Symmetry: C3
Subunit: 340 residues, 3 copies
């Protein structure tokens, strides 16, 4: 949906309206993702202008609006800016941009973020390199310098964000990524490291002086089938919670496995199967604990370019004896999607 393309600047305003309802037992106190109305809406703009033949300029913004709130004092719950960045792009040297963007481990973790509603549990927001972080300076090179094509690599720097809370805070850091596609396949390497703030060190769960994250994945996005497998590891950069002690902090070391498989049909139904197991290792008091564990059967039906429905059915395999109390119940998600 492009609205203004006149001089050298093309501007498209994009948004979506999603009507969701979650299905769980109880009130969602022991469940994955909860229970009840969780509808929302999105709105943002993407910009692109040509300064000359080679150097271009771009910027993007995106917002999250929530419809499951009331019209009272609880109106802005989960209303937030997902993207806010701007930068330039030259021909062969690459592109620099700055603002609120993703991390460089999301190049690996984004391969299994293809489910209807859930999935991409390892891609936590404000988790130093795996989600949308405010204050990132990213340099991306698409095809090496024109030397070979289908060989992506990027380099990121992270700015110091000392907030009031310890879950969203981070410090200075450096990351990088290497990707390669050929014959419809795909392989991604990614690694990032950042130094912690003193508010994050004083938390009871987790102790350390540097937060390291890495991941590597594969891909078979060709011939209407999708297959991917991400394996990653994380030191001092995983947000955990202890509901038995009411103490929150980070995990010392965490190992993550994600799988996904999809098939697209000609009329437009897309079945999906997925498996995710994230295990936190050597946390204080507990030992080895499993954070995320589910099988998944779901399906997405695409009516056209703009209208869609999806059903997403979580089979939680946490064995209801978790020492962190992560919540172990099955969840069904049924949604209706319009976008432009």
């Amino acid at each position: 949906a492009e609205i203004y393309n006149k001089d050298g600047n093309k501007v498209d305003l994009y948004g979506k309206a999603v009507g969701l309802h979650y299905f769980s037992k109880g009130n969602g106190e022991n469940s994955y993702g909860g229970n009840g109305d969780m509808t929302y809406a999105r709105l943002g703009f993407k910009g692109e202008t040509q300064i000359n033949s080679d150097l271009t300029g771009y910027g993007q913004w995106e917002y999250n609006f929530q419809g499951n709130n009331s019209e009272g004092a609880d109106a802005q719950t989960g209303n937030k800016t997902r993207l806010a960045f701007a930068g330039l792009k030259y021909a062969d040297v690459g592109s620099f941009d700055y603002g609120r963007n993703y991390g460089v481990v999301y190049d690996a973790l984004g391969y299994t973020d293809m489910l209807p509603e859930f999935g991409g549990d390892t891609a936590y927001s404000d988790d130093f390199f795996v989600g949308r972080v405010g204050g990132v300076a990213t340099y991306r090179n698409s095809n090496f310098f024109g030397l070979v094509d289908g060989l992506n690599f990027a380099v990121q720097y992270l700015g110091k964000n000392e907030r009031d809370t310890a879950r969203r805070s981070n410090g200075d850091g450096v990351g990088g990524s290497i990707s390669y596609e050929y014959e419809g396949f795909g392989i991604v390497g990614a690694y990032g490291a950042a130094d912690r703030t003193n508010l994050q060190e004083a938390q009871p769960l987790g102790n350390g002086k540097k937060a390291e994250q890495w991941a590597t994945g594969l891909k078979y996005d060709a011939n209407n089938i999708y297959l991917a497998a991400n394996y990653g590891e994380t030191r001092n950069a995983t947000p955990i919670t202890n509901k038995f002690t009411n103490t929150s902090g980070f995990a010392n070391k965490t190992q993550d496995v994600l799988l996904v498989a999809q098939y697209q049909f000609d009329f437009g139904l897309r079945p999906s199967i997925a498996y995710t197991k994230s295990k936190a290792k050597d946390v204080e008091g507990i030992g080895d604990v499993d954070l995320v564990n589910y099988f998944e059967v779901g399906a997405t039906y695409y009516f056209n370019k703009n209208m869609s429905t999806y059903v997403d059915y979580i089979i939680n395999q946490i064995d209801s004896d978790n020492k962190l109390g992560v919540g172990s119940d099955d969840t069904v998600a049924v949604g209706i999607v319009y976008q432009f």
Copy 2:
């Protein structure tokens, strides 16, 4: 104001800027609607796409922005999402949609919601069936199945919304509506019932286990004159306040009368007269009390399709001895409207 109609999807972005100032005595502590600056602004999008000849898809979102706030810590006061929904529509069977939409009693109560600023006092927001409620699943049939035209009927289901406050909360419920227009006239039937939450039961004002609402109205929207009369009743679903006790809750039974009359001229001035009397019956301690009571003379001048002014003058007839302290003073509202 439609901006993008290219492939099968027409998207129009709509908004308005309203500059309001209320006129009352004192600070609005004993007044209807208050005193001072109450300007605001709206913004949203409406979407419509054709999947094929018969099945279409649609979605809508709307936001309220407030200009009477400052640029300090009180910025988002009364900033909220009014509409957020999405659904499909087939040819003869009807249309299903889900999200944040109106209720099915608003088909009756919307006939007298035609004033410049005020009016539609019975149409409270988050009052189970008479305003915009988040989590509604509505099925609407326009003309019966093509069998007769000018015969509307709808069926709604309400989802359980157990919030932190008791005024916005609700439970599961079922409602329905029947409408009929012929020869420019109109007649609407509407009824809805929902079961209360346990936070609503523990409130001191009002006690009960089910919230029932119904209304029925008439219409003469033809030949540039407007005439309508809504009569409705409500059991356990009316938000009241006791300023003498500082206790808030619901009313046991409430009976509501609304009248309106308008005339449009060729140059564009629209005078208005209205009468609203809402009476709460058998509340604890008080007995029978009158919540809403006013005469009204107002006028709206339309410059063109987009620019307008209106004056709206409340003659409050609450006799300054109300046992709930509802506020009994006259209020003038003067506004300037731009929209697109």
Copy 3:
């Protein structure tokens, strides 16, 4: 970027994405403007319709979105409506509008508000006549009545805004402005006076019963050079802070000097030099104190109509012995700008 111009109504949606990073020593506790990520984004619409040949109608809205926040509970920090107003315009008598707009001293103080990021320190928001105030009723005349052109004058009325805080509050007031441009030059007179609220009187810093502001400036915006000089004075209308006592209030009398100089080149780099000195006189306990004091060297490079970069380097000349603890450190600002 105009999107809808069809019937008589032209509507343009405008926004920008700015990626900023501030450079200071420490955490910005003794600095001008702070330290760290300060990126943001803007979005709004401007409207214009012709009712007939002479009378037109217009309205505008603008919002501030902040990207330096997280996606947690601190999401809406500094998110606010900058503009919200609407009104009409006739041919020769002028134009009336109402809502949230600027003040009439901003006609004088806006001449030196031409820096890349900083500058316009005297133009405080919600400071009765020098910033964007909610509840203003402004009448502006462009060229006198068609009698002479290049002679602007305006008259403003201020409504009573009794808020919860004393910094954003104000009372009823009257202001006016006179401007004159000829041969590329410019000269502006401006004055405004308003009566204080009782919450503003009870504050320890500053005491008085009326807030008076005035300013007068010059201009040489011709032949690609810019030169301007604003001198203004202010009685009982300047927000000050005492970090040594943790007491906040207003200043009794304040005198302000602003200078600016710019040069535009053909390829698009714009160097800038500026000098601002604001001095508060006869405050309680301190005496005469200097609030704002800096030299400035900065530059803005315009790539095209839509893409730009700027560097802005504060040379703070507060002598680190200020009795109010205003903060005395140098600050560099580096930004990347996209707009449409």
